[PDB]
Ligand binder design. Structure first.
Ligand SMILES: Nc1ncnc2c1ncn2[C@@H]1O[C@@H]2COP(=O)(O)O[C@H]2[C@H]1O
Ligand SMILES: Nc1ncnc2c1ncn2[C@@H]1O[C@@H]2COP(=O)(O)O[C@H]2[C@H]1O
Ligand SMILES: [Mg+2]
Lengths: 214, 213
C-alpha cells in the first residue's frame, strides 16, 4: 500500500490510479538525471529504483533504494525545478507516472493526495535532520576521550566535577552518546563515574583512546 | 504569502478565515523544540527567530521571519515534535492554522495543500545541498585525524604519502582526499608536494581532526 494513498477509500485509490501512465525501465537504464527538466513523479509498480546525487569530482552519494509502492520525482513535479537527484533502474522496473497537468486535476478531486505528498516530504526532512546529527560510536569514543584529555591538561585533575551535558558541549556530541561512551570507558576501567563526577584512572590509556591508537 | 500562490483574491480571504490570531509580545516563546505542535503559523506582523538545539545545549539560528512568512508546518503535517524553537523578537502577531482546520481548508482549496508540498520540496532541495556538504565536512575531519595519527605515531611533520594511502587511512576515496588536502592547504594547515604532505599547524590540525575547527 502506497503512502501517497493513505486515508483514501478503495474506490478513491482506483480513482487516483486512473490519472497515471505506464512507463517501463529495463535493468540498468537511467530513468532521469540530476539537473534534468522534470514534469512527472513516479510510483514503483514493480522492480527497484536507486536515487543518488553526484558531487566531488563525479562521485555518487546514494539517497534511496525504492521498491514497489514507493514514490520519487515529486519535487520537479511540484516546483518545476531541475531534478534534485538521478534515478536509475536496478531491476527491470514498472513505473506509474503522474504528469503535472494530470496531478493538478487529480488533487482537485482528492486534496488528500497533495497533503500526502506534503507529509512524505516532511518525513524525508526529518530523516535529513537526523543524518546531520549522526556519528559512529567509534569516533564518538575518540572525541569524548579527547574532551576528557582537555580537562586533564588544565593541570588539576584527575577528578572532575562535570555533568555529561557539559562534556557533550565540550566534545560536540549529544548528552546521550557521552553517557554511552562514559559507560564503555568505565567498563574498560579507564574512568570512574559518580554523582556529577568523572575520574580518569588511566590517563595514558585515555590519551591512546583519544588519538585512536586504542 | 507563497502559501496562497495561485489563489484568487476572494479565495485568499476564505483561506485566511480558517486561521486564528495569536499575539506574542517581544521576547515571548511561541513554541519549543520537542513540543507536540498542533498548528502552523503565518507572521502577520513583528519578527520571529527560529532556532534549533544542537548537542550540549547550544542553539543554531535557522532563520529570522517577518510578515508573510510561514513556519511550524512539520508538526502540523506529521504530528511529530517541533524540530525548532520559535520566539518573538518583536511584538508579534501570528495567524495560526490548527490541524483540523487545515484539513477542512485544503478540502475546500486543494491548491493550499499543493503550495505546502511545494514549499517543503524547496526545503528538501536546500537540505540535499547541505548534506552533500556534510560528506565533505566529515571527510575533512577524518583526513585530519589520519594525518594527526601519523604525527602522534612519531612520524612527520613531513610525510612521504600518496592520496590513496591517506584515503585508506581516513576511510574515504582518493578523489575526496585530494579535495580535502587542497582545502587544508588553502587553510594553511598543510603544505603539499609530489608525494608529500607536510603538517604546518599541528594544533589546528588536531582541532580539525576532532570536529572543533
Ligand atoms: N533526501 C532525500 N531522500 C529521499 N529522496 C529524495 C531526497 N531528495 C530528493 N529525493 C527524491 O529524488 C527525486 C529526484 O527528482 P525530484 O527532485 O523530482 O524528486 C526527488 C525526490 O523524489
Ligand atoms: N533547516 C530549516 N530551515 C528553515 N526552516 C526550518 C528548518 N528546520 C525547521 N524549520 C522550521 O521551524 C519549524 C519548527 O516547528 P516545525 O518542525 O513544526 O516546522 C519547522 C519549520 O517550519
Ligand atoms: Mg475550529
Amino acid at each position: 500500500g502506497s503512502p501517497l494513498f493513505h486515508g483514501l477509500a478503495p474506490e478513491e485509490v482506483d480513482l487516483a490510479l486512473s490519472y497515471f501512465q505506464r512507463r517501463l525501465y529495463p535493468q540498468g537504464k537511467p530513468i532521469f538525471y540530476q539537473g534534468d527538466l522534470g514534469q512527472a513523479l513516479y510510483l514503483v509498480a514493480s522492480g527497484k529504483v536507486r536515487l543518488f546525487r553526484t558531487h566531488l569530482g563525479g562521485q555518487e552519494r546514494t539517497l534511496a533504494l525504492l521498491g514497489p509502492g514507493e514514490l520519487f520525482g515529486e519535487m520537479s513535479l511540484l516546483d518545476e525545478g531541475e531534478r534534485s537527484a538521478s534515478a536509475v533502474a536496478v531491476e527491470d522496473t514498472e513505473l506509474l507516472a503522474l504528469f503535472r497537468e494530470d496531478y493538478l486535476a487529480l488533487i482537485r478531486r482528492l486534496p488528500l493526495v497533495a497533503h500526502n505528498l506534503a507529509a512524505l516530504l516532511a518525513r524525508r526532512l526529518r530523516e535529513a535532520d537526523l543524518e546531520l546529527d549522526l556519528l559512529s560510536f567509534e569516533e564518538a569514543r575518540n572525541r569524548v576521550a579527547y574532551a576528557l584529555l582537555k580537562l586533564l591538561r588544565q593541570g588539576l585533575g584527575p577528578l572532575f566535577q562535570i555533568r555529561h551535558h557539559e562534556l557533550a558541549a565540550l566534545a560536540g556530541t549529544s548528552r546521550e552518546t557521552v553517557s554511552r561512551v562514559l559507560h564503555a570507558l568505565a567498563e574498560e576501567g579507564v574512568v570512574r563515574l559518580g554523582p556529577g563526577t568523572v575520574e580518569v584512572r588511566e590517563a595514558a590509556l585515555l590519551e591512546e583512546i583519544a588519538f585512536g591508537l586504542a
